[PDB]
Scaffold this active site. Sequence first.
Site, mmCIF file in Angstrom:
data_model
loop_
_atom_site.group_PDB
_atom_site.id
_atom_site.type_symbol
_atom_site.label_atom_id
_atom_site.label_comp_id
_atom_site.label_asym_id
_atom_site.label_seq_id
_atom_site.Cartn_x
_atom_site.Cartn_y
_atom_site.Cartn_z
ATOM 1 N N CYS A 182 -4.835 9.488 -4.373
ATOM 2 C CA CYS A 182 -6.029 9.889 -3.649
ATOM 3 C C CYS A 182 -5.806 11.333 -3.204
ATOM 4 C CB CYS A 182 -6.318 8.925 -2.482
ATOM 5 S SG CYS A 182 -4.892 8.432 -1.385
ATOM 6 N N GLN A 198 -3.588 3.758 6.115
ATOM 7 C CA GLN A 198 -3.386 4.484 7.361
ATOM 8 C C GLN A 198 -4.413 4.185 8.448
ATOM 9 O OE1 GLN A 198 -2.936 8.602 6.470
ATOM 10 N NE2 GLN A 198 -4.188 8.511 4.586
#
Lengths: 289, 289, 49, 49
Positions: free
Chosen positions: A225, A269
């Site tokens: 990503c 996250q």
Amino acid sequence: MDERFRTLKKKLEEGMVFTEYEQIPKKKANGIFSTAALPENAERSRIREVVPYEENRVELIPTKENNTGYINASHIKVVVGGAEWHYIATQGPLPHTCHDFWQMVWEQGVNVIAMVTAEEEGGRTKSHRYWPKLGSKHSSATYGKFKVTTKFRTDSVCYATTGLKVKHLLSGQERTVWHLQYTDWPDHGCPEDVQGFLSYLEEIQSVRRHTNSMLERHPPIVVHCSAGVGRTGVLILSELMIYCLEHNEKVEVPMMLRLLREQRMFMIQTIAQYKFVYQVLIQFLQNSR
Amino acid sequence: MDERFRTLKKKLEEGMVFTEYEQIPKKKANGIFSTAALPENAERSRIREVVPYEENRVELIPTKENNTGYINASHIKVVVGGAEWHYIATQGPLPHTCHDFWQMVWEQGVNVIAMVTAEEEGGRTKSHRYWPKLGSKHSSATYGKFKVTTKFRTDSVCYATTGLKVKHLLSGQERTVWHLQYTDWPDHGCPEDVQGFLSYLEEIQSVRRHTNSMLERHPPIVVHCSAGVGRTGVLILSELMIYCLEHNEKVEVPMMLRLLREQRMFMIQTIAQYKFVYQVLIQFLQNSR
Amino acid sequence: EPQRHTMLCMCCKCEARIELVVESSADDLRAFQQLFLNTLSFVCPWCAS
Amino acid sequence: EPQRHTMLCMCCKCEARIELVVESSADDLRAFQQLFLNTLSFVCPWCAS
Ligand SMILES: [Cl-]
Ligand SMILES: [Cl-]
Ligand SMILES: [Zn+2]
Ligand SMILES: [Zn+2]
């Protein structure tokens, strides 16, 4: 799987899945990042704070310009039901690390790249364009020792599949790489179209089996990503848990997340990403009934 | 094959290859043609004089309109080097035998049709159009119980390859048939472009191996011209002799012709056709060097 | 059931983009994609004439 | 070396004839032909719009 569906729903109703997420340490206590921490390698990481552990970083063949063979990438290995799964989780290439990226693809024998981001999102760069545009300069581009040619693109609603040829300019050897880009992730938060994300996982699974059959072994797929931990972690956790459910392995999601974090810091996250994984699994199980 | 080349050339210089052709009987002395000779079957043969022997005629499942299951077609079987070769040699279908033809294709499990003629040559009809035209009526046509659909055509210089789907209208079963039509045979005499005929044989060999691989057994291919003996005999003799040379079997061409005539009368009906076969073999051997 | 798919590719003679629209099963779509990664290339209509 | 081949087929929506011009090896040509005998069909430009 009806018992698996009801079990998962009950756990989501117990009110502790977000509680246990907070208690999962974001990274190893006695973690060592020697090569990533070198000042020569500062500019090679997109997010300075997110770097591979030394023991499982992807090590490239040294070159004069990159003598530690450093790329911000980790080997992620998990054994589920007698099957070893191997991923490389990496950041979106920078303009000056595109040749490193293709060097990693070559050395590791990668057949499939799963790109879970657009190049630019909301004005901020998430990944350099490290593969050619169709029709632009013979649909080809050269990154260090690697000439890459785009041969086709098939657009789906939520993702695009691009077939690439990669040529090593010293040996002349040519190889195929499949580039699978998820195009539906919003600029902030998580995608509302859960089914579309499941379709993307479906395509990854399908292209992995196709490329494995062509080589008539099982190299890692590359997942990236921007920093290689958030959406990358969502994809990897989702695929591993879907396989766990499909073959009835009694692994809890937080246990799998702990093992992924053992191998790359910060994987998944946000709580919103973690809750998204659960909704992916719920939708996969509803699809089965 | 250099010894095979020199041997063949010597035999052609001995001045007896045309002598021995004249002495090959055109058909079996005690030949029996019971079913072909019935008055109900007179209209089913394009050339009244050219009919199958009873013992190896292709027998169709009886129907009310065709109770002897008669079609002007012969099973041609030859064993060369431990390998059995199976052809069906037949006439170009008539307007009222197209359903018989497709019935034969179905019962015999035929995957490949080798059509060594145009539909009309010099004004005279050689074969009915027994397969559909692209773009005409959904590219489909129905012949008795069989719906045939043309899916593609690839034109080469000397021949055309057409892919067909055949549907049995009672069972719904669908099958594939490859239709290979040689387009370079002149209205009289034999083709001057020997290499082009060799390219056609190449395509037949290639499509036979392809269809055999798809069925992962070895059905007959169908070969037809107008009466199913002249150009049909040229094709079959050529393929058998090319295989004999490629695997070094000591069979003489006149011996092979005698065996073909044992199975269908008049196979290779002119000296010019017989001499054409030899020039095909010479060109195949020259191609090897 | 077959679905509609679009294949974008480049003419092998002139760099122009070619849009092919097919209907097929998923397996036949993958097989078609694989042909582009072997030797199969398309010629645009202009270069064809 | 790859050769030029022309594939004639029918649009799966409107019966119009489609001319596809490819360059490919013989093996990839055969594989492409086989796809038409499975499920692969082309849509003409008009039906595509
Ligand atoms: Cl909660
Ligand atoms: Cl003579
Ligand atoms: Zn062009
Ligand atoms: Zn149309």
